[PDB]
Design an enzyme around this catalytic site. Sequence first.
Site, PDB file in Angstrom:
ATOM      1  N   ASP A 106      -1.586  -0.086  -4.653  1.00 54.83           N
ATOM      2  CA  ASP A 106      -2.848   0.565  -4.990  1.00 54.83           C
ATOM      3  C   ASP A 106      -2.649   1.993  -5.511  1.00 54.83           C
ATOM      4  O   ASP A 106      -3.471   2.501  -6.275  1.00 54.83           O
ATOM      5  CB  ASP A 106      -3.845   0.530  -3.806  1.00 54.83           C
ATOM      6  CG  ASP A 106      -3.292   1.173  -2.531  1.00 54.83           C
ATOM      7  OD1 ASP A 106      -2.061   1.350  -2.426  1.00 54.83           O
ATOM      8  OD2 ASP A 106      -4.102   1.494  -1.620  1.00 54.83           O
ATOM      9  N   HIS A 107      -1.557   2.623  -5.081  1.00 56.69           N
ATOM     10  CA  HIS A 107      -1.197   3.993  -5.457  1.00 56.69           C
ATOM     11  C   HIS A 107       0.117   4.352  -4.756  1.00 56.69           C
ATOM     12  O   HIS A 107       0.655   3.544  -3.997  1.00 56.69           O
ATOM     13  CB  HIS A 107      -2.276   4.959  -4.989  1.00 56.69           C
ATOM     14  CG  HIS A 107      -2.516   4.889  -3.518  1.00 56.69           C
ATOM     15  ND1 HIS A 107      -1.722   5.552  -2.606  1.00 56.69           N
ATOM     16  CD2 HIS A 107      -3.425   4.192  -2.796  1.00 56.69           C
ATOM     17  CE1 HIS A 107      -2.144   5.276  -1.381  1.00 56.69           C
ATOM     18  NE2 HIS A 107      -3.182   4.464  -1.471  1.00 56.69           N
ATOM     19  N   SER A 131      -7.385   4.075  -0.864  1.00 57.71           N
ATOM     20  CA  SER A 131      -7.095   2.647  -0.754  1.00 57.71           C
ATOM     21  C   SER A 131      -8.320   1.780  -1.024  1.00 57.71           C
ATOM     22  O   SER A 131      -8.184   0.630  -1.439  1.00 57.71           O
ATOM     23  CB  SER A 131      -6.556   2.311   0.639  1.00 57.71           C
ATOM     24  OG  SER A 131      -5.339   2.968   0.912  1.00 57.71           O
ATOM     25  N   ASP A 157       0.828  -1.194   0.000  1.00 59.47           N
ATOM     26  CA  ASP A 157       0.000   0.000   0.000  1.00 59.47           C
ATOM     27  C   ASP A 157       0.870   1.255   0.000  1.00 59.47           C
ATOM     28  O   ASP A 157       1.770   1.409   0.826  1.00 59.47           O
ATOM     29  CB  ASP A 157      -0.975   0.008   1.189  1.00 59.47           C
ATOM     30  CG  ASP A 157      -2.119   0.999   0.993  1.00 59.47           C
ATOM     31  OD1 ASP A 157      -1.843   2.194   0.770  1.00 59.47           O
ATOM     32  OD2 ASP A 157      -3.295   0.585   1.050  1.00 59.47           O
ATOM     33  N   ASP A 188       2.192   2.760   3.357  1.00 59.71           N
ATOM     34  CA  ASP A 188       1.375   3.954   3.159  1.00 59.71           C
ATOM     35  C   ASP A 188       1.460   4.939   4.332  1.00 59.71           C
ATOM     36  O   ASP A 188       1.470   6.149   4.123  1.00 59.71           O
ATOM     37  CB  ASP A 188      -0.081   3.538   2.930  1.00 59.71           C
ATOM     38  CG  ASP A 188      -1.018   4.725   2.782  1.00 59.71           C
ATOM     39  OD1 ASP A 188      -0.931   5.432   1.763  1.00 59.71           O
ATOM     40  OD2 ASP A 188      -1.861   4.938   3.676  1.00 59.71           O
ATOM     41  N   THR A 219      -7.953  -2.158   2.406  1.00 60.59           N
ATOM     42  CA  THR A 219      -7.375  -3.112   1.454  1.00 60.59           C
ATOM     43  C   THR A 219      -7.892  -4.538   1.642  1.00 60.59           C
ATOM     44  O   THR A 219      -8.483  -5.100   0.716  1.00 60.59           O
ATOM     45  CB  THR A 219      -5.831  -3.072   1.454  1.00 60.59           C
ATOM     46  OG1 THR A 219      -5.413  -1.716   1.322  1.00 60.59           O
ATOM     47  CG2 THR A 219      -5.260  -3.872   0.278  1.00 60.59           C
TER      48      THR A 219
HETATM   49 MG   LIG Z   1      -4.120  -0.621   2.738  1.00 62.64          MG
HETATM   50 ZN   LIG Z   2      -3.584   2.849  -0.188  1.00 55.71          ZN
HETATM   51 ZN   LIG Z   3      -3.002   6.530   2.332  1.00 52.76          ZN
END
Ligand SMILES: [Mg+2]
Ligand SMILES: [Zn+2]
Ligand SMILES: [Zn+2]
Lengths: 346, 346
Positions: A272-273, A55, A14, A230, A108
Site C-alpha cells: 500500500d506504501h 493504509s 503493508d 508496517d 487493510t
Molecule cells: Mg495493513
Molecule cells: Zn499501510
Molecule cells: Zn503504517
Amino acid sequence: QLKTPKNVILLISDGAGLSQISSTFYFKSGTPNYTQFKNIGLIKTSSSREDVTDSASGATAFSCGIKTYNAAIGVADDSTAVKSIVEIAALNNIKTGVVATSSITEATPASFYAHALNRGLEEEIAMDMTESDLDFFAGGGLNYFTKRKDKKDVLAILKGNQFTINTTALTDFSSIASNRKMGFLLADEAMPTMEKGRGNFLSAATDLAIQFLSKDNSAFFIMSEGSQIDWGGHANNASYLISEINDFDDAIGTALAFAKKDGNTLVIVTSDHETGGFTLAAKKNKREDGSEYSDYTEIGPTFSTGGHSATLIPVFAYGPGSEEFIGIYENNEIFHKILKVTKWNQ
Amino acid sequence: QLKTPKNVILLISDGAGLSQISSTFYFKSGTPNYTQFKNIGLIKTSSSREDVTDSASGATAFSCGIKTYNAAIGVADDSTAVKSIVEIAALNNIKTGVVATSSITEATPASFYAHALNRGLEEEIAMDMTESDLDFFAGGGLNYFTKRKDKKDVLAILKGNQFTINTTALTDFSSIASNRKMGFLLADEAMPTMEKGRGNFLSAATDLAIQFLSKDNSAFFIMSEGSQIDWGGHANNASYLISEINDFDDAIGTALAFAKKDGNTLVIVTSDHETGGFTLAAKKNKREDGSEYSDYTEIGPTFSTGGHSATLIPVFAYGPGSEEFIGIYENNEIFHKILKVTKWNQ
Ligand SMILES: [Mg+2]
Ligand SMILES: [Zn+2]
Ligand SMILES: [Zn+2]
Ligand SMILES: [Mg+2]
Ligand SMILES: [Mg+2]
Ligand SMILES: [Mg+2]
Ligand SMILES: [Zn+2]
Ligand SMILES: [Zn+2]
C-alpha cells in the site's frame, strides 16, 4: 490478447517498499519467492488529499478503485460507500476470502469488506463483517466481536449469518469442508509477531482459504495481508520488519505453488506504501578514534522516519492476465486492472 | 523473430534507487518520461566481494558482464582485463559513444572504455582513452588530459587518433558532422551542477551522440550518465539530488523520442545502486512543546546514510528486445542480455 484468469489472489505487504523487499535477498535463507516473477509494474500511492498515504485510503484504492482521503474505509472522497471488488466478486458468483496478521478489523482487510467514514470505527467495521459477502476470513481481532464497548455479541450475529467460527486454532481443510462460510479469530487483537512464535499462520491460512473457496469447482478471490511489516517500519526495528517480510515471502511461495499447478490463477503482490525509509546501508564499523566508518562488505539496515513515505511501489504479477500489471500507474488502477482481466460484470 | 534492436542506448542514473526515481513524480513539472516504460525489471547490485557496491564494480558489471571487486574498472575479480561492450561493439562494426556529467574519467564512463586496477587512477584512465575504439565522448575532466603528473598532452595523442576535440562548448551537429571522431571536454573537473546552470547538456550531448554515431547509417551503442544524482545522495542534499534526476529524466525523454521514431533502438535505463537512503517522508512539523509530528499532506525528503545501499534497482527497457530485461536478476546480466538481443557476437 491476454489469457483470462478464473481466480485471483492479491497479496499485500503493508509498508513494504523496494528496500524492504530487497532485504529478503540478503536476510532470508534460500532464494526469495519474489524471483519467480517476470511481470513487474510500479504504483503511485498518494491519496485524494495527501501526498503520503495511510493504509485505509491505500487499501481502498485497491479494493474499490478510487482515490480517497486518509482514514477512509471503502468510501469515496465525499464519504459515500463505493462498490468493492469483493462485492463485485460475490455478484459474479465468485467465492471471497480475506486473511491478515493484524486484527481482521484493521484498515487493510477492512477495506475489502466494510464501508466506514473512518478506520478508527473498528467495532462498526466488525459489525459490517456480518453484512458482507465474505465466505472466508482469518486473522486476529476477537475483542471487536466479543469485548465491545457496546457490549453486543457480534460473534452470535456472525454465526446467525451462516459463518462457522473458530477461535482456537487453524484447522486442516477436512475439518471445515462441509461449512458454508468459515471465520478464524485467533487473537484478541493482532496475531503474534513472528519473533513471538506466530509461525506459518499466513501461508497456512492462505492455503486453507484456497482449498475452501475452490470447493465444488468455484472461482475465488483472496486478499492476504502481511500486516505487521508496517509495524516494524514504524518502530524502526529491523529484525521485526525483516522477519515479517520473510514470512510474507513464504506466503508468496504458497500462492505461486498453487497458481503454477492450477494454471488459471492470477497472483498479484504489491504494497500500500513504504514506511520508515528502511535502507540497506553499509554496516558501520568502529576502530579506536576515527571512531565510525562504513564497511561495504556487509549491510546494517537504517531508517530515516517513523512514518510512511511516498515512494512508488513495486507490483508483481504472475498467471493469466499478469501482463496488464506492468508499466507505471496510480494505485487505484489495481482494481480496474483486476476487473479488466477477469472480465467480471462491474 | 521479436525482436533485434540495431542500436542501443544505455542511460545510467548514478545512485538512483526507486525513491530517487519517485521524486520526479512529485518534484518535476509535468509527467516524468519514466512513465513511457512498460517493461520493467530489477537488479541485485552486490559486487563480487561486497554486499554494498561502489560505482566502479557496479558499472563494470554492466559494461563487462562480470561481478568484480569495488574499485575495479573493466577488470575481473582476479584483476585481469575483460572485454567490454564498447570493444565488442567495435568488433561488430558498431559505432560507440560515452556521455557523463562528471569528469569523463570517473568510474562509470571509465568502465566503458578503460581497464585499470583501481578507479582512482584517472590520469591512467584518460590515457587509456587513446587505445580504445570510442567514437564519441562528452563530459568534464579536461585536467586529466592536459594538466598531468607526466606532463603529456593527451589531446595531442587523441587528435592523432582522428579525434576532433572541443573544450569550449557543445556545438550544433553541423559543426561536427564531418569529423571522424569527436570529443567534448567542457570543464576542468566535473561539469557544473544543474543548480549552477549546467542546463540541458546531458540531453543535448546525447542527441549529438545519436546524430553523430548514426552517420552513414551505422548502428550505435551509447552510454549516457546522470552522474551527479549520486553526489546529491552523499551530501544528503535534496534539491541537488532532485534537480540532477529531473535532468536525467529529460535525457530519458530525448532518448525515447529518438527511439520511438527510429523504431530500431533499444533504450535501457537503470542505476548502479542507491545512495543516501533518500526517502519521500512526510513533512515534519514542530509543536512548540513536543516539537515533531508528521504532516502527510506534504513531502519532506530525508536521508539515513552518507553512503550507498544494497536495495534492488529498477531497470526500464523500451524497444526491440525490451522484454528480455524484465524479472529479477544480477546486475551483470545487463551485459549478457544486451548481447543476446543485439546478436553482437564474439
Ligand atoms: Mg495493513
Ligand atoms: Zn499501510
Ligand atoms: Zn503504517
Ligand atoms: Mg529487533
Ligand atoms: Mg558514476
Ligand atoms: Mg539544497
Ligand atoms: Zn555509483
Ligand atoms: Zn557514490
